[PDB]
Amino acid sequence: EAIPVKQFVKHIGELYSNNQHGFSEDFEEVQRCTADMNITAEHSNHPENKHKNRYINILAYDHSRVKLRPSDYINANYVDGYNKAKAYIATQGPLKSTFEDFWRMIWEQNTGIIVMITNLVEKGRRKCDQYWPTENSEEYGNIIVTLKSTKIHACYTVRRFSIRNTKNERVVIQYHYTQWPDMGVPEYALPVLTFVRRSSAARMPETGPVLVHCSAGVGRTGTYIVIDSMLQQIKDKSTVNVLGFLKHIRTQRNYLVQTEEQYIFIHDALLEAILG
Numbered sequence: 658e659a660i661p662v663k664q665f666v667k668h669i670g671e672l673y674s675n676n677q678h679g680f681s682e683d684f685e686e687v688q689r690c691t692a693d694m695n696i697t698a699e700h701s702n703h704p705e706n707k708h709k710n711r712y713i714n715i716l717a718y719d720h721s722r723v724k725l726r727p728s729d730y731i732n733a734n735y736v737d738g739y740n741k742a743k744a745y746i747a748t749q750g751p752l753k754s755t756f757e758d759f760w761r762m763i764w765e766q767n768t769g770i771i772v773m774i775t776n777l778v779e780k781g782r783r784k785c786d787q788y789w790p791t792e793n794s795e796e797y798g799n800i801i802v803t804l805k806s807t808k809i810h811a812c813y814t815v816r817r818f819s820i821r822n823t824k825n826e827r828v829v830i831q832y833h834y835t836q837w838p839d840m841g842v843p844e845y846a847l848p849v850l851t852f853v854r855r856s857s858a859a860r861m862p863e864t865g866p867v868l869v870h871c872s873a874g875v876g877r878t879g880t881y882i883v884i885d886s887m888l889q890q891i892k893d894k895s896t897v898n899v900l901g902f903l904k905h906i907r908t909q910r911n912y913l914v915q916t917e918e919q920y921i922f923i924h925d926a927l928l929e930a931i932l933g
C-alpha cells in the first residue's frame with residue numbers, strides 16, 4: 658500500500674498533532690508486529706557466541722544473519738533497501754574481539770561503504786570499539802586496513818580506507834556521523850538528510866551491501882535505513898510507505914528503529930526532503 662506524497666504530506670499533520678500520539682500509536686503497532694513469528698536466533702544465543710554480542714538482548718535473526726565463509730557467526734543481518742534485496746548489512750559496533758570477524762565480513766561481503774552513526778564514547782559510556790587505524794595501517798586477521806585520508810564536516814566525517822586480504826585491494830569509505838545527540842535524535846533533520854544523501858550516493862553499482870552500524874546496530878541504524886529507502890522510493894515513484902516498510906525490515910533484524918522519537922524523526926527528515 659504505497660501512498661502518494663500529496664496525501665503523505667497532507668495528512669501527517671494529524672500524526673504530529675496532539676503531542677504526537679498518532680505516531681506513538683503507529684509505532685506501538687510496530688512494537689507488536691514481530692511478536693508471533695517465532696523468528697529464530699539460536700546462533701546469537703548459543704553460549705559460545707555470547708561474548709560476540711555487544712548486548713545480550715540484541716540478536717541476529719537466523720534467516721538473515723550474515724555468515725562469514727569457512728566461527729561463522731557475526732551479530733549482523735542483511736536488510737532490504739527499496740527494490741534492492743539485501744541492500745544493507747545492519748550491524749552493531751564491533752568489539753575488540755570481533756574486529757577480525759568484522760573486517761572479514763567486509764572483505765567477503767564485498768562492501769564498499771560503511772555508515773557509522775555513533776561516537777566511540779558517548780556521555781562517559783563506551784558505544785563502539787575503535788575498529789580502524791587511527792593513522793597508518795593496522796592488521797585484523799588477514800586484512801590490513803590502511804587510512805588514506807580523513808575529511809571532517811560539521812556533522813559527519815569521511816575516512817577513506819584501503820584494505821587488503823593477505824591471502825587484492827579495495828577502497829572502502831566510511832561516513833561517520835558525529836553530532837548525534839547524547840539523548841534522543843538530532844534537532845534538525847537537515848544535516849542527517851545531507852549525510853544520508855552523500856553516503857547513499859557513494860554506492861558504486863556492482864558492490865555488496867552497505868554496512869550500517871551504531872552501538873546496538875538497531876536504533877539509529879534502523880532510522881538510517883528507512884530514511885534512505887523512503888527517499889529513493891520518493892525520487893523514483895513519488896510515494897512512501899514508512900509504516901509498511903518498517904514492519905518488513907523488522908523481520909530482518911530486531912528493533913530496527915528502536916524509538917518513537919526516532920520514528921517521528923524519519924518523518925521530519927522525509928518531509929523536510931519533500932519540501933527542500
Ligand code: VO4
Binds near residue numbers: 915
Ligand atoms: O546504538 V543503537 O542500535 O541502540 O541507536
